[PDB]
Short mmCIF file of N, CA and C in Angstrom, two decimals:
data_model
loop_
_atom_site.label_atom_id
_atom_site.label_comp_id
_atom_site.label_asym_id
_atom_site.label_seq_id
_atom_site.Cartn_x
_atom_site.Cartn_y
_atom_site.Cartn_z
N UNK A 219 58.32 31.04 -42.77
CA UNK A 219 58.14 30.06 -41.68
C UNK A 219 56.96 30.43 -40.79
N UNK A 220 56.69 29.59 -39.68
CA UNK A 220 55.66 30.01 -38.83
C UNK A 220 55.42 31.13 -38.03
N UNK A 221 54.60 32.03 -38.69
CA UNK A 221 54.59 33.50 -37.67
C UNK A 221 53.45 34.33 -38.33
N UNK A 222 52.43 34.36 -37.53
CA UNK A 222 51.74 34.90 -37.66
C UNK A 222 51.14 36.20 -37.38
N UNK A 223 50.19 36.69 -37.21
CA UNK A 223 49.77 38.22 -36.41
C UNK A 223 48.53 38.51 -36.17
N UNK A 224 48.21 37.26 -35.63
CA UNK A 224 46.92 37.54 -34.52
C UNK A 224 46.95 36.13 -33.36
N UNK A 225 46.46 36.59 -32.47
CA UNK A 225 46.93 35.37 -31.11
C UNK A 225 46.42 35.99 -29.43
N UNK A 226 45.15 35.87 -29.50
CA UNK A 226 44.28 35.93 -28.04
C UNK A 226 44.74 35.20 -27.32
N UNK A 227 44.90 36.07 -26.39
CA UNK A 227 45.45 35.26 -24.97
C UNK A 227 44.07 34.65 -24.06
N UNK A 228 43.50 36.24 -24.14
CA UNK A 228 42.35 36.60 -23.24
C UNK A 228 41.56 37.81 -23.68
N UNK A 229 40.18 37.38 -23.90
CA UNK A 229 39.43 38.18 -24.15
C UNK A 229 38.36 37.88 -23.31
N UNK A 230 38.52 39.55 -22.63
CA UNK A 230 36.79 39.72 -21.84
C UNK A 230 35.79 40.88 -22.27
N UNK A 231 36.46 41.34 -23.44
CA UNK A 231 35.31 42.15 -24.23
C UNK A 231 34.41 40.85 -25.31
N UNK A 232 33.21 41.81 -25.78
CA UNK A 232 32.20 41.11 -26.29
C UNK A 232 32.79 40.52 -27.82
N UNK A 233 33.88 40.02 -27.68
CA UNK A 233 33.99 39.45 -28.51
C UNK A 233 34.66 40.75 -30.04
N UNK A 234 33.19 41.72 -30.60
CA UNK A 234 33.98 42.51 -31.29
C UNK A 234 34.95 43.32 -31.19
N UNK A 235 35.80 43.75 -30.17
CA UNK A 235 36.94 43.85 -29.78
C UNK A 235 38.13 42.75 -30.63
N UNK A 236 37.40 41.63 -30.60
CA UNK A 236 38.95 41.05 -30.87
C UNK A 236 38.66 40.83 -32.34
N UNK A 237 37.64 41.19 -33.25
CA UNK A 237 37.50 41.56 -34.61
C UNK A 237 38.01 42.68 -35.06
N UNK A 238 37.53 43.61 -34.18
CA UNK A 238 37.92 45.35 -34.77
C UNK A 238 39.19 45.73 -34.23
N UNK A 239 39.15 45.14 -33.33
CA UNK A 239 40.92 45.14 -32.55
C UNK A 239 41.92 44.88 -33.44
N UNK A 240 41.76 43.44 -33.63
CA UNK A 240 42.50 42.46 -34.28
C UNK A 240 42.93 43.07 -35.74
N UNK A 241 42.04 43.45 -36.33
CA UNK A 241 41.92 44.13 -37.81
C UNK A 241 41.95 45.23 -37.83
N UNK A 242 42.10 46.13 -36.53
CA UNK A 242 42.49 47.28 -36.70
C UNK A 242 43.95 47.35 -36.22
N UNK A 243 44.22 46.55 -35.64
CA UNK A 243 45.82 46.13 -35.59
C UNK A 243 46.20 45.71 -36.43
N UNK A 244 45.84 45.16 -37.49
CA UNK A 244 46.08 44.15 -38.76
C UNK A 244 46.60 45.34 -39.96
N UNK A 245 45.28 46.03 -40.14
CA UNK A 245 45.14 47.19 -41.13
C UNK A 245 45.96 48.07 -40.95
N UNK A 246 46.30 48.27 -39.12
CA UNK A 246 47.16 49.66 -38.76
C UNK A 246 48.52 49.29 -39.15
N UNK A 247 48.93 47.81 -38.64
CA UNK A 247 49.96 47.19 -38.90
C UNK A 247 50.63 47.17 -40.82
N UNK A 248 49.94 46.99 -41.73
CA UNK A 248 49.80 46.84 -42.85
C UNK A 248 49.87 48.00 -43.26
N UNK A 249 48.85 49.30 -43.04
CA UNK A 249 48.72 50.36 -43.53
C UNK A 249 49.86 51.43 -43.03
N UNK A 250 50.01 51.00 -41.79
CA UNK A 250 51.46 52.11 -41.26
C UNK A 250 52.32 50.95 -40.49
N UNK A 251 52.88 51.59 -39.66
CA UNK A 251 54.25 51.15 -38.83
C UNK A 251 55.12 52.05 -37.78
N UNK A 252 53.70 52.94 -37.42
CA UNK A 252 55.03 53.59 -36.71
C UNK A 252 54.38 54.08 -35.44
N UNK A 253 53.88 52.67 -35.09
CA UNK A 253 53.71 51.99 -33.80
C UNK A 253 52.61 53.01 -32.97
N UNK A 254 53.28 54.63 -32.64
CA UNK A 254 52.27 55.62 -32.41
C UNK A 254 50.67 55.35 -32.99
N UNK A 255 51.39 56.36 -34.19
CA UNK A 255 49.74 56.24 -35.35
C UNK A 255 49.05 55.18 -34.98
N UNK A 256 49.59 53.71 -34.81
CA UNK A 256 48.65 52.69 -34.52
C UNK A 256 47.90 52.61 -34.02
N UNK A 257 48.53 52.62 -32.31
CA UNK A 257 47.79 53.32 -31.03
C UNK A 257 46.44 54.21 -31.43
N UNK A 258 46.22 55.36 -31.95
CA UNK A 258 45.60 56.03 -32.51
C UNK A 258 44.61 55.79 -33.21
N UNK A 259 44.85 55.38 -34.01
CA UNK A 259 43.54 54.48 -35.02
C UNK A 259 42.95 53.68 -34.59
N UNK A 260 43.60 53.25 -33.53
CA UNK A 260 43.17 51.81 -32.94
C UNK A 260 42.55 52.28 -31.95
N UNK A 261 42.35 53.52 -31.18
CA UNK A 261 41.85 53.57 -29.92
C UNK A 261 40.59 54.76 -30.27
N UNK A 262 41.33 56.00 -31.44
CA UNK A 262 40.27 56.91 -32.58
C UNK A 262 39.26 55.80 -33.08
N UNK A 263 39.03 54.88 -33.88
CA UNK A 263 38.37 53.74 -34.04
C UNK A 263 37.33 53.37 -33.55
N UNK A 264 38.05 53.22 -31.89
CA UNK A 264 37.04 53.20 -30.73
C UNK A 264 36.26 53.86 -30.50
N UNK A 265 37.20 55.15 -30.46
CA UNK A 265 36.55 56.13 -29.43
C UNK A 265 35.67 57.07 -30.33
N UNK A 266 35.83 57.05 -31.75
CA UNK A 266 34.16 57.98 -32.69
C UNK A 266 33.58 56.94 -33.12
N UNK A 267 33.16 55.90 -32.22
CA UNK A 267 32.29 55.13 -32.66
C UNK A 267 31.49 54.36 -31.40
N UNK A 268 32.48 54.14 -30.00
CA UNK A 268 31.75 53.59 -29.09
C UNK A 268 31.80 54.63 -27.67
N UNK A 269 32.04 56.07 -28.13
CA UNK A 269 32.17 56.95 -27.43
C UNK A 269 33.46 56.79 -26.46
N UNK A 270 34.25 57.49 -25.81
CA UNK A 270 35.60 57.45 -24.56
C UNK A 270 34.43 56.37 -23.35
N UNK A 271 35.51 56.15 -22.77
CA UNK A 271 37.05 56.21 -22.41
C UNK A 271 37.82 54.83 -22.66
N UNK A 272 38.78 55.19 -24.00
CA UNK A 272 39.39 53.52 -23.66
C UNK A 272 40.63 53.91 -23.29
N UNK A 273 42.01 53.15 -23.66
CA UNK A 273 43.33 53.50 -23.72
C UNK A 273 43.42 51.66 -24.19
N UNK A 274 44.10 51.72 -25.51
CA UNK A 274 44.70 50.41 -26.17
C UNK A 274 46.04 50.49 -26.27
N UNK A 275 47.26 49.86 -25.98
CA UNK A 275 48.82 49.65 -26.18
C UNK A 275 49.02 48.79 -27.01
N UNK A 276 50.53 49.20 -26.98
CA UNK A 276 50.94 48.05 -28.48
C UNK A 276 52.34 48.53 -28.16
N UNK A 277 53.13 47.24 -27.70
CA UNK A 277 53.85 47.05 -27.27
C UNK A 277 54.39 45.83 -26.37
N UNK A 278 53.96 45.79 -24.96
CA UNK A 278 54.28 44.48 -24.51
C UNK A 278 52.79 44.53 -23.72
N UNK A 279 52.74 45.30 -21.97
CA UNK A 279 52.56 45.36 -21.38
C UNK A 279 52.42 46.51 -20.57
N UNK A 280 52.99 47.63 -20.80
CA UNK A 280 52.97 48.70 -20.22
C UNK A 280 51.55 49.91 -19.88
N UNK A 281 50.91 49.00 -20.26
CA UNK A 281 49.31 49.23 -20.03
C UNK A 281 49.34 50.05 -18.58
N UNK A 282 48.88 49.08 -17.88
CA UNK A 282 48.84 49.33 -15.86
C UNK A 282 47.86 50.22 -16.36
N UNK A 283 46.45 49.59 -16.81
CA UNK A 283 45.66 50.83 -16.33
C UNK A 283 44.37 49.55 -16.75
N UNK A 284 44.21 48.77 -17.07
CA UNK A 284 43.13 48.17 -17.20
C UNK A 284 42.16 48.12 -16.06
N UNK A 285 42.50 46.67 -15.19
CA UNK A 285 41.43 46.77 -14.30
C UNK A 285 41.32 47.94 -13.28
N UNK A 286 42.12 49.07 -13.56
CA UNK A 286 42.19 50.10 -12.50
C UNK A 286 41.27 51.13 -12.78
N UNK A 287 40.39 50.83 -13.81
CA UNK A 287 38.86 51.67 -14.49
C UNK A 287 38.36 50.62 -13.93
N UNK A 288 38.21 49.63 -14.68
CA UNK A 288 36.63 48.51 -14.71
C UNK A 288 37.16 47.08 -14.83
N UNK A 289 36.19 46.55 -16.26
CA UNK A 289 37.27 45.31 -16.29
C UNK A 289 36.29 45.28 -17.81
N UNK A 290 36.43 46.18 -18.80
CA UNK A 290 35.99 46.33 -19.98
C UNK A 290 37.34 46.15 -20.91
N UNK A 291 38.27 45.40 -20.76
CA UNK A 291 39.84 44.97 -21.66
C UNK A 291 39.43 43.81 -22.79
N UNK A 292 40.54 44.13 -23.45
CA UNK A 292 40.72 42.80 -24.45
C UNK A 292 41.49 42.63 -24.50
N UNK A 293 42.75 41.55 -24.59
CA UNK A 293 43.86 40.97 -24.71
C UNK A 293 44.22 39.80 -25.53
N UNK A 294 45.28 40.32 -26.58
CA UNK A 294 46.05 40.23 -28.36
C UNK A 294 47.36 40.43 -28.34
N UNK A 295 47.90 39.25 -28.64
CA UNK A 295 49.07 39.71 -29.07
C UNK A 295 49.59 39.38 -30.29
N UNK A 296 50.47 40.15 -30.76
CA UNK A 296 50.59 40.36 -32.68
C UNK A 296 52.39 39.41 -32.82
N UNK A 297 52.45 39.27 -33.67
CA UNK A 297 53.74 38.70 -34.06
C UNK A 297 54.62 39.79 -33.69
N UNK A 298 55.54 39.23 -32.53
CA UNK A 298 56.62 40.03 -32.25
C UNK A 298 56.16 41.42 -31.48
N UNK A 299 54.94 40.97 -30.88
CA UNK A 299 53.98 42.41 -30.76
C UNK A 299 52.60 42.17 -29.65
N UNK A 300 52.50 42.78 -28.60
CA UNK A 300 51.33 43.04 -27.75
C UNK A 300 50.54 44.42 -27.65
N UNK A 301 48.89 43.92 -28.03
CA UNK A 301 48.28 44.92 -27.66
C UNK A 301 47.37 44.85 -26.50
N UNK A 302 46.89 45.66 -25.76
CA UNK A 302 45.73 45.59 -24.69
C UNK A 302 44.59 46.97 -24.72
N UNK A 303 43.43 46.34 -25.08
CA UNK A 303 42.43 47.28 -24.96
C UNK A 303 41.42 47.10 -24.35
N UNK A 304 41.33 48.71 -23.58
CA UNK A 304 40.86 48.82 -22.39
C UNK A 304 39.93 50.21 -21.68
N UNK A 305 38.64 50.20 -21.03
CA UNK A 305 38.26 51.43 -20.83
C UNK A 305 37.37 51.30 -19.70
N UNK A 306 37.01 52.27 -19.37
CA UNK A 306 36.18 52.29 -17.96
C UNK A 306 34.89 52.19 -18.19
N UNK A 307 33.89 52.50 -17.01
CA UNK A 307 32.68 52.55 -17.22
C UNK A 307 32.37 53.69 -16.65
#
């Protein structure tokens, strides 16, 4: 039935965020499951490639740290599933 696993709410990153995000939530999702590791890949991903500082969740909401760096976030949520990624300047 209808259910998918990708669904922008809000995106204020440049856009590749919600490609590499999206598909690294996709891939992490697919390739593992155990929600941690995700986090990880998904934020490792980031971070040996567009240098620190981010912090990405996956979960609902329990972020509370976005605009409290900058306002460098992206916002996704997955079937049955929220992520938010996010980093300072």
């Amino acid at each position: 039935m209808s259910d998918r696993k990708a669904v922008i709410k809000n995106a204020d990153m440049s856009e590749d965020m919600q490609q590499d995000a999206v598909d690294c939530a996709t891939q992490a999702m697919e390739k593992y499951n155990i929600e941690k590791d995700i986090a990880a890949y998904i934020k490792k991903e980031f971070d040996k490639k567009y240098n620190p500082t981010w912090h990405c969740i996956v979960g609902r909401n329990f972020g509370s740290y976005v605009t409290h760096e900058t306002k460098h976030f992206i916002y996704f949520y997955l079937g049955q599933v929220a992520i938010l990624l996010f980093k300072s300047g």
